[PDB]
Scaffold this active site. Sequence first.
Site, PDB file in Angstrom:
ATOM      1  N   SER A  39       0.811  -1.238  -0.151  1.00 41.76           N
ATOM      2  CA  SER A  39       0.011  -0.017   0.015  1.00 41.76           C
ATOM      3  C   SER A  39       0.692   1.363  -0.026  1.00 41.76           C
ATOM      4  O   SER A  39       0.089   2.381  -0.239  1.00 41.76           O
ATOM      5  CB  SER A  39      -0.975   0.042   1.149  1.00 41.76           C
ATOM      6  OG  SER A  39      -1.544  -1.147   1.284  1.00 41.76           O
ATOM      7  N   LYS A 201       2.112   7.185   4.619  1.00 45.64           N
ATOM      8  CA  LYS A 201       1.181   6.064   3.971  1.00 45.64           C
ATOM      9  C   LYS A 201       1.960   4.703   4.615  1.00 45.64           C
ATOM     10  O   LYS A 201       2.971   4.512   3.987  1.00 45.64           O
ATOM     11  CB  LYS A 201       1.425   6.149   2.603  1.00 45.64           C
ATOM     12  CG  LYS A 201       0.417   5.165   1.976  1.00 45.64           C
ATOM     13  CD  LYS A 201      -1.069   5.292   2.232  1.00 45.64           C
ATOM     14  CE  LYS A 201      -1.926   4.134   1.870  1.00 45.64           C
ATOM     15  NZ  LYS A 201      -1.733   2.793   3.030  1.00 45.64           N
ATOM     16  N   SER A 202       1.099   3.898   5.040  1.00 43.36           N
ATOM     17  CA  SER A 202       1.872   2.609   5.463  1.00 43.36           C
ATOM     18  C   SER A 202       1.367   1.550   4.542  1.00 43.36           C
ATOM     19  O   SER A 202       0.474   1.694   3.686  1.00 43.36           O
ATOM     20  CB  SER A 202       1.377   2.250   6.992  1.00 43.36           C
ATOM     21  OG  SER A 202      -0.036   2.051   7.058  1.00 43.36           O
ATOM     22  N   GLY A 203       1.835   0.275   4.843  1.00 49.33           N
ATOM     23  CA  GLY A 203       1.635  -0.747   3.819  1.00 49.33           C
ATOM     24  C   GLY A 203       1.985  -1.984   4.530  1.00 49.33           C
ATOM     25  O   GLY A 203       2.736  -1.933   5.504  1.00 49.33           O
TER      26      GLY A 203
HETATM   27  C1  LIG Z   1      -0.880  -2.200   2.000  1.00 42.97           C
HETATM   28  O1  LIG Z   1       0.131  -2.694   1.616  1.00 42.97           O
HETATM   29  C2  LIG Z   1      -1.085  -2.471   3.375  1.00 42.97           C
HETATM   30  C3  LIG Z   1      -1.931  -1.883   4.150  1.00 42.97           C
HETATM   31  N1  LIG Z   1      -2.747  -0.803   3.786  1.00 42.97           N
HETATM   32  C4  LIG Z   1      -3.015  -0.382   5.102  1.00 42.97           C
HETATM   33  C5  LIG Z   1      -3.018   1.258   5.476  1.00 42.97           C
HETATM   34  O2  LIG Z   1      -2.710   2.034   4.958  1.00 42.97           O
HETATM   35  O3  LIG Z   1      -3.653   1.467   6.652  1.00 42.97           O
HETATM   36  C6  LIG Z   1      -4.652  -0.646   5.347  1.00 42.97           C
HETATM   37  O4  LIG Z   1      -5.195  -0.337   6.564  1.00 42.97           O
HETATM   38  C7  LIG Z   1      -5.055  -1.556   4.487  1.00 42.97           C
HETATM   39  C8  LIG Z   1      -5.448  -2.928   4.702  1.00 42.97           C
HETATM   40  O5  LIG Z   1      -4.311  -3.666   5.351  1.00 42.97           O
HETATM   41  O1  LIG Z   2      -0.736  -2.468   1.999  1.00 43.03           O
HETATM   42  C1  LIG Z   2      -1.657  -2.154   1.646  1.00 43.03           C
HETATM   43  C2  LIG Z   2      -2.845  -3.164   1.723  1.00 43.03           C
HETATM   44  C3  LIG Z   2      -4.091  -2.768   1.423  1.00 43.03           C
HETATM   45  N1  LIG Z   2      -5.246  -3.447   1.436  1.00 43.03           N
HETATM   46  C4  LIG Z   2      -5.460  -4.592   2.431  1.00 43.03           C
HETATM   47  C5  LIG Z   2      -4.937  -5.682   1.592  1.00 43.03           C
HETATM   48  O2  LIG Z   2      -4.697  -5.775   0.258  1.00 43.03           O
HETATM   49  C6  LIG Z   2      -5.038  -7.154   2.367  1.00 43.03           C
HETATM   50  C7  LIG Z   2      -3.828  -7.972   2.138  1.00 43.03           C
HETATM   51  O3  LIG Z   2      -3.784  -8.304   0.814  1.00 43.03           O
END
Ligand SMILES: *C(=O)/C=C\N[C@@H](C(=O)O)[C@@H](O)CC=O
Ligand SMILES: O=C/C=C/NC[C@H](O)CC=O
EC number: 3.5.2.6
Lengths: 257, 257
Positions: A39, A201-203
């Site tokens: 993300s 922005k985390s991921g």
């Molecule tokens: C996407 O690679 C990982 C997480 N995205 C997160 C964020 O920005 O908060 C999230 O909450 C969505 C599901 O993990």
């Molecule tokens: O870090 C960003 C992640 C974003 N959306 C939640 C998922 O993709 C769930 C795991 O695939």
Amino acid sequence: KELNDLEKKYNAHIGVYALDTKSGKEVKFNSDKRFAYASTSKAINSAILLEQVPYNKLNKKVHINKDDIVAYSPILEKYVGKDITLKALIEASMTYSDNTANNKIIKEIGGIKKVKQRLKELGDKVTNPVRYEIELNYYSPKSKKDTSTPAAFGKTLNKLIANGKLSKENKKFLLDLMLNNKSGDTLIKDGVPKDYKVADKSGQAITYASRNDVAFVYPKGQSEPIVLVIFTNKDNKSDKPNDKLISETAKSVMKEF
Amino acid sequence: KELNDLEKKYNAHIGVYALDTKSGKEVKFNSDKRFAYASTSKAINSAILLEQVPYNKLNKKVHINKDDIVAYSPILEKYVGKDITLKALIEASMTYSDNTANNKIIKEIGGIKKVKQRLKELGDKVTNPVRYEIELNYYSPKSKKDTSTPAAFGKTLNKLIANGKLSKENKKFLLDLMLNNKSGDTLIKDGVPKDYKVADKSGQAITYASRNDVAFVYPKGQSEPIVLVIFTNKDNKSDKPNDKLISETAKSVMKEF
Ligand SMILES: *C(=O)/C=C\N[C@@H](C(=O)O)[C@@H](O)CC=O
Ligand SMILES: O=C/C=C/NC[C@H](O)CC=O
Ligand SMILES: *C(=O)/C=C\N[C@@H](C(=O)O)[C@@H](O)CC=O
Ligand SMILES: O=C/C=C/NC[C@H](O)CC=O
């Protein structure tokens, strides 16, 4: 503290790239080693759209059907058969990490090839987006897909956003979202000095405890931001991550500025 | 337009309570009929904590373990074994409708009995919280649990928040969150005049297409808010809701002010 004993303490792999935009000072660590951005990438696509549509024109509406919908789209999941603006797509991608939003954003930009195209303009040879959501977050040590190095990612964030071509308005819209986002409080924001401002922005990828945080960090009393990319992962597919890992990495690195 | 043909057009059941705080004018419709409030309730608990802890003291940290964790806690799901402030619990409940957050909030207030206690002080005889998350959102036409009428809910929102005892700071913190929340853009916000400001908290029960939106609505050029509660449901357990239902209800009702 030493990144190496962070790595030992956590039994994790740390990838760090920090750039002081004022001074041009960098703090690198496993800087050219590839990791899944997951993300964090939502910030790039967002900024790429932001360059291409003035703030006034984000009211532009796009139509979502059922075909558009992917997993973990807390916002967009309700839009089957409706229109949403460019403005709200970005809000949903940025604040909620909304997977349909991101997808539709890449689409509005003109697809992955267009992203690939922008990257290269940015002189970003490494970031390798191949997939769409939610598969772009499916990390394997053995594949390069939807990976970058903390450096290439970082350099690009700098070039697109910090020292980019965004308008006052568009730059502010995007940074505010990253600043207001409470989603990554346990990450970089958790490790920086009390009166610092963090626009991240985390991921997180599904595997190898792939945990990341990307930010524009504003030292208490400093206008120009420090660009900070922290990527982390672990040995086993099913390993879960310790966010405190990133917090302590942030804490350390910030020491150098 | 007529609520009755909204009800026909959508084949839904509409419950509306609107209060002009300036004038004291009300718009009622199926006003004393009970519906599941679901997540709209997060605003009440939040405000109840807000009354009890000054803004300065929201930095107060509470410990979350695995026992604390319930479903659909996008924020709190990462806090197993860590502390989070009162400030961030509220942020998570309000912006992300975070189920653990809400739970911990009720807990900080002193439990359901304490909520029950506040309600009665407010002269709220109807709102009947019985369960914790995520079960408090498990509507059955046959049970009164975690139900209220658009009127009792509305009256209480007015009393707690609009015309409440909150501090400038606490009142602003809470309203801003409700104002910034992009989660219910397809609801009330979707139906009001273009230059109106909407501070809502939406909700949805698992069954009978139970869809709600609660707000403080500020007419373009009006400081005092209109308190708006819209509850909707349908005949069958497995019916899905049409958010446009609420948007069109909002559109109509707003006409009267
Ligand atoms: C996407 O690679 C990982 C997480 N995205 C997160 C964020 O920005 O908060 C999230 O909450 C969505 C599901 O993990
Ligand atoms: O870090 C960003 C992640 C974003 N959306 C939640 C998922 O993709 C769930 C795991 O695939
Ligand atoms: C609560 O009863 C229903 C929904 N809460 C939502 C909201 O406020 O956005 C939500 O997104 C959480 C899961 O539906
Ligand atoms: O209305 C508020 C809903 C909040 N959290 C999501 C669920 O509880 C999922 C259904 O039970």
